[PDB]
Design a protein around this nucleic acid. Structure first.
Ligand SMILES: [Zn+2]
Lengths: 141, 65, 53, 83, 167, 71
RNA sequence: UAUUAAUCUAGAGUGUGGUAGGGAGUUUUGGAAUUUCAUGUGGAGCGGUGAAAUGCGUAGAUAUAUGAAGGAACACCAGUGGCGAAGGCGAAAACUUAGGCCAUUACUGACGCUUAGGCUUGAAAGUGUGGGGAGCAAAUAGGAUUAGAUACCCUAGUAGUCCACACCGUAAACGAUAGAUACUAGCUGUCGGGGCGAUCCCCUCGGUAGUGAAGUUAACACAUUAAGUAUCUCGCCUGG
């Protein structure tokens, strides 16, 4: 509430999110701020249901003109993040599209891939169970 | 110590404070640098400009006292 | 630079002013490029800022 | 010598609409006129030529936008001299 | 826009014909008026101009269209009696905002600070005092409202204390 | 392991156990190391003069201790 | 994602107020100094270099003081400075004109970035035409040095160096670092804007320097103005 600091979104949502999360992970920071989008929302909750980040609350002004969102990252007392590596395959002008029969498994299943086939974000294993392939957002491991 | 900034002079013009500009001219008809006048860079530039205009207007000498 | 009262006290400042006059006169008697002017002037300013502080 | 406030009311559609592209294109046309007079007066003021090119291209982008969004939006604006 | 001009007359001649020259060059202007003829009197020249050693300095304070000066410019150079024709405009670096004009306070307080006629010469113009009026006049807010109540979490510390025990 | 009297310019991640005390003032130094010395001497069966002492023993003589900033 | 129907303002522009700056062009002025001439003062050397010597000098040089002329460039202000997209911009003034900075509830409503091709600019040198030509100085001659010297030094000395109109379009045209966007420790400065408010200091928004963490780097080093974390686009490279 009342962040009293101007913020501006970089560019395409997936990259705008990944750059911030990686910089925060390296800088040992706690939270970062960015404008909110439905795809960014979906990826945020699909991540947190995997337990890879702490509190994330979408925030708006005293109106529905601007909506922003912040998030904290899953840490430990020894101060080590739960994220190890992040890389996006989808890219503006370089969209990837993957049939289920050739779906890749991140780091022998240890990593997480985001595949928004037709119903939004979903885990790679639950998509294999669905045997539904499609567009791939990014690698998280 | 920029006395102009100290007093908030806020404006300089040729014919109001001529003696304030002789105080800044060296005895040998040259402009004294920052190390002597102690003014800020912008006031010092304004003083140099005004002293050049006076130099033009035959108000201060060129090469002697 | 007119300053002399009795014997010698003016002469020390005379050496000072003669030194600065020679300094100002040496660089207007031999020609070389304007870039050399600027670089040498900055070098002299750096010497003043590093030695006299 | 440009009287910025005067021309604004000419093409103005409302009381306090200043971002309506008609006023900007009108001011750009007047500025281009003045800068053309200046350039023909001073054949060697090159930075004025740079500014004039910038302004005419800015007008080109504004008019491309306008003619793109709505076809009937610029019906009253073709009355202004162009091309 | 304001205009300021300094006039140099041909020196040793009497003061009256200098004012005649004042009026003569006053007719040299275009449709501009609203000035004062105040002059600075006779002053010794800092250096010879052609052969004279002194002159009188005359001023105008009018303000008019850009056409004003050109005819005066081509007249003054021809007139042998008038010598120096500085033409000041508002292109000088200036400021007269009403919110900043009342700096006479700074003048007066600097003067009291300088006014140390007493024997106790302990005051120093170049000396800090660490004062604070604390006029913020800046908050730059950006209000936010709660739209979602996603997975909760708590806070903790970053103190490091390892090895548990010795043996 | 290592324990340190970490001033404000130290690097916390290096030292194992951190004690944020001011080492510039000699009185603070003597205080801290005397409490440490008695904390180990009580395990050495010696009386802890400055450790667990209520009061009226901690105060040690000191030349005028001020001016934390240094040139 | 693409298409299309719409809506909003943070993106991006326009307005408002405040604001700096050697930004540029055109039109005028000034003074030092050199050179030439003239006027007096004066009688043998001057200049020159490591040392000398062509060269200049009683037909009065150098020097000293004054006056006239013309041409070129603008010490001292001048900076761990400012502006410009780049090349560059600093004695004074006027006109025209550029873009820039801070707060902008105002307006408009995604109108943006990149940009093949196209267009504009672009240091010096050089070309054509007419001027101008003080000093400097390619080429050229002479005196020295050397074994030789078509060079380094000296005495002259032409183009040119300056202005007006057209052309050339190259440079170690460099931060050897394409542009745009967001994030990521810190510290020391400096300059511009706002407020508090004698400067001194406080902070805010920006530019410009130094130091320096992680990170990157083959290393050197870079590091909030990245050569880091990434994305978009253009251009480029494939041993000598
Ligand atoms: Zn000042």
């Amino acid at each position: 509430i009342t962040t009293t600091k101007p913020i501006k979104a970089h560019f395409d949502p997936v990259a705008d999110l990944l750059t911030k999360i990686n910089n925060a992970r390296k800088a040992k920071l706690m939270t970062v701020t960015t404008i909110a989008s439905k795809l960014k929302i979906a990826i945020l909750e699909i991540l947190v249901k995997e337990g890879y980040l702490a509190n994330f609350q979408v925030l708006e002004n005293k109106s529905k003109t601007k909506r922003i969102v912040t998030f904290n990252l899953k840490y430990t007392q020894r101060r080590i993040p739960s994220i190890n590596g992040v890389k996006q395959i989808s890219k503006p002008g370089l969209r990837i599209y993957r049939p289920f029969e050739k779906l890749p498994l991140v780091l022998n299943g240890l990593g997480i891939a985001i595949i928004s086939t037709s119903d939004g974000v979903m885990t790679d294993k639950v998509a294999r169970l669905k045997k539904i392939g499609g567009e791939i957002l990014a690698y998280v491991w | 110590y920029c006395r102009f900034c100290a007093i908030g002079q806020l404006r300089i013009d040729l014919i109001d404070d001529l003696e304030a500009l002789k105080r800044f001219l060296s005895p040998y008809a040259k402009i004294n640098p920052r190390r002597i006048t102690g003014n800020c860079q912008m006031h010092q530039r304004h003083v140099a400009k005004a002293l050049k205009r006076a130099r033009y207007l035959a108000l201060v000498p060129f090469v002697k006292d | 630079e007119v300053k002399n009262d009795d014997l010698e006290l003016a002469l020390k400042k005379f050496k000072r002013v003669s030194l600065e006059i020679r300094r100002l006169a040496q660089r207007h008697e031999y020609h070389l490029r304007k870039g050399m002017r600027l670089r040498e002037k900055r070098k002299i300013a750096q010497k003043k800022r590093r030695k006299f502080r | 010598q440009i009287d910025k406030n005067g021309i604004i009311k000419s093409a103005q559609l409302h009381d306090k609409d200043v971002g309506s592209i008609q006023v900007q294109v009108s001011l750009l046309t007047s500025q281009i006129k003045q800068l053309t007079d200046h350039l023909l007066a001073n054949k060697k003021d090159f930075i004025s030529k740079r500014g004039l090119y910038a302004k005419v291209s800015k007008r080109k982008r504004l008019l491309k936008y306008l003619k793109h969004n709505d076809l009937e939006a610029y019906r009253n604006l073709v009355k202004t001299l162009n091309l | 826009m304001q205009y300021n001009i300094i006039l140099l007359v041909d020196g040793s001649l009497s003061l009256e014909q200098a004012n005649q020259v004042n009026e003569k060059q006053q007719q040299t202007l275009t449709n501009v008026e609203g000035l004062q003829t105040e002059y600075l009197g006779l002053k010794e020249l800092a250096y010879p101009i052609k052969k004279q050693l002194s002159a009188h300095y005359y001023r105008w304070k009018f303000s008019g269209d850009n056409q004003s000066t050109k005819d005066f410019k081509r007249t003054a150079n021809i007139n042998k009696q008038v010598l120096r024709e500085l033409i000041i405009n508002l292109e000088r670096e200036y400021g007269y905002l009403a919110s900043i004009n009342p700096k006479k306070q700074q003048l007066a307080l600097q003067k009291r600070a300088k006014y140390d006629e007493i024997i106790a010469r302990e005051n120093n113009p170049e000396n800090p005092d660490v004062p604070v009026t604390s006029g913020l006049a800046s908050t730059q807010p950006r209000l936010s409202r709660t739209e979602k109540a996603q997975k909760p979490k708590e806070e903790l510390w970053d103190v490091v204390q390892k090895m548990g025990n010795f043996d | 392991p290592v324990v340190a009297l970490c001033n404000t310019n130290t690097n916390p991640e290096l030292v194992d156990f951190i004690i944020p005390a001011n080492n510039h003032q000699p009185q603070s130094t003597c205080l801290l190391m005397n409490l440490l010395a008695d904390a180990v001497a009580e395990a050495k069966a010696m009386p802890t003069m400055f450790a667990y002492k209520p009061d009226e023993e901690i105060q040690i003589e000191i030349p005028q201790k001020q001016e934390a900033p240094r040139q």
